[PDB]
Design a protein around this ligand. Structure first.
Ligand SMILES: O=C(O)CCC(=O)C(=O)O
Ligand code: PRO
Ligand SMILES: [Fe+3]
Length: 267
């Protein structure tokens, strides 16, 4: 049987990723593949227990660490459409630091405050450097009006930015109101210098973005959902210092075994 040979990014695509801190590949997965991922996401929301977050409404907001519990999601992170590019960009073997599905229901979502993901991973999880990235799979078309991820392009180039801390514990690392949000003034400067961009794309697209790029999103006023599957790949050399870790495995992985690609089988 045959998997399609590993595809990697072009030099131009790599350059664009390093400069901007994000990159969209359209139509990586087809509709049937997206429907399978959507059905598995629904199962995870229903059966995820303590791994599930909820929104004012008690409506499901997020589920975490699904690659450890779902055979489908365990295979997805090894996909030949994903793993080769993560290896290319991080210039290493890689593993999954974090996995989450963020629902942003039609008419329903919440405001994710400005943040850098690395700030959490560094301070909560002991990630020593920002040699990590996230792949966001669009389960639905992402538009202007359904609460797209919004970035400051080039905003990753200064590194970790000083952030207000709010409360001990980790409960508020997954909430609308975030543990590390960005100085109102620091953001103004960044945006005045670099601007703001919300990448769009059809269902089945993949949005790659740097661990350190500032991002945000608003509620969904469209009649259409905005499901994102977010896979955070980390360089194996950049494995986190488990002695400085504070969160469970379904938020911050502790098995640093290098991922290998999915091969074709008869089942
Ligand atoms: O789903 C969103 O709009 C925000 C996701 C995010 O930035 C995060 O979970 O860190
Ligand atoms: O706590 C975490 O790791 C994720 C990434 C930043 C927001 N929540
Ligand atoms: Fe984030």
């Amino acid at each position: 049987q045959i998997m399609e040979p590993h595809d990697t990014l072009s030099p131009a695509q790599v350059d664009e990723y390093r400069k901007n801190g994000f990159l969209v590949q359209e139509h990586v997965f087809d509709e049937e593949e997206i429907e399978l991922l959507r059905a598995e996401a629904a199962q995870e929301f229903a059966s995820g227990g303590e791994r599930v977050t909820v929104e004012n409404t008690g409506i499901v907001r997020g589920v975490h660490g699904c690659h450890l519990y779902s055979e489908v999601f365990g295979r997805l992170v090894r996909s030949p459409r994903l793993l080769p590019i993560a290896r290319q960009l991080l210039r290493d073997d890689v593993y999954v630091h974090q996995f989450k599905i963020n629902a942003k229901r039609a008419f329903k979502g919440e405001v994710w405050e400005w943040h850098q993901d690395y700030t959490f991973w560094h301070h909560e999880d002991g990630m020593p450097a920002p040699r990590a990235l996230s792949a966001a799979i669009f389960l639905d078309e992402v538009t202007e009006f359904n609460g797209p991820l919004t970035f400051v392009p080039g905003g990753h180039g200064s590194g970790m930015i000083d952030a207000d801390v709010k409360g001990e514990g980790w409960a508020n690392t997954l909430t609308a109101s975030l543990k590390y949000s960005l100085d109102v003034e620091t953001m103004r400067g960044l945006i005045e210098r670099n601007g703001m961009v919300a990448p769009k794309g059809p269902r089945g697209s993949v949005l790659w973005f740097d661990a350190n790029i500032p991002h945000s999103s608003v509620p969904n006023i469209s009649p259409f959902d905005r499901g994102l599957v977010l896979i955070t790949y980390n360089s194996v050399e950049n494995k986190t210092d488990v002695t400085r870790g504070t969160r469970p495995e379904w938020l911050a992985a502790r098995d640093f075994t290098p991922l290998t690609a999915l091969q074709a089988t008869s089942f």
